[PDB]
Amino acid sequence: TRDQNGTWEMESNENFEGYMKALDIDFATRKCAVRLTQTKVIDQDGDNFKDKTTSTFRNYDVDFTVGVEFDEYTKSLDNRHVKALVTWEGDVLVCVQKGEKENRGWKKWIEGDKLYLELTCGDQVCRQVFKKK
């Protein structure tokens, strides 16, 4: 069949490491790209194609309610276990994760068209910045 439209998620990929070697990718990048999942989207018009591949590492879905404390299994990070309590401080969404590490929490808020996420653990502060899309 020549009809290749649709979304195809990779399920097996072999000798990717070698194909990347003969292309002269550095070793650091190689031992990463083999951890990403790939997803192909092909749009076909007889013989006119528009296909976009995407290598996606891991992803977390957390669905909760503010004021409630709930169970967060930080799979895709360190699979640690915390008690997460979320509260508002003005317009800023603040969570603290009561558990193994101290100062494990985050802050998220909207300022114009960029969403600000601060991630803090220990004496480390991570600053994440997102523009809408």
Q: Which of residues 108-127 bind its own copies (CB under 8 A)?
A: 108, 110, 112, 114-115, 117, 119-127
| 30, 33, 94, 107: which one binds its own copies (CB under 8 A) | 33
Q: Is 9 one of the binding residues for its own copies (CB under 8 A)? A: yes
Torsion angle of C-alpha atoms 74, 78, 84, 90, degrees rounded to 10: -100
Q: Is 70 one of the binding residues for its own copies (CB under 8 A)? A: no
Q: Please count the residues of this chain forming the interface with its own copies, following the rule CB under 8 A.
A: 83
First-to-last CA distance in the chain? Answer: 36
Q: Is 27 one of the binding residues for its own copies (CB under 8 A)? A: no
Q: Is 58 one of the binding residues for its own copies (CB under 8 A)? A: yes
Q: How far apart are CA 38 and CA 28, in angstroms?
A: 19
Q: How many CA atoms, within 13 angstroms, populate the side-chain half-sphere of residue 129?
A: 5
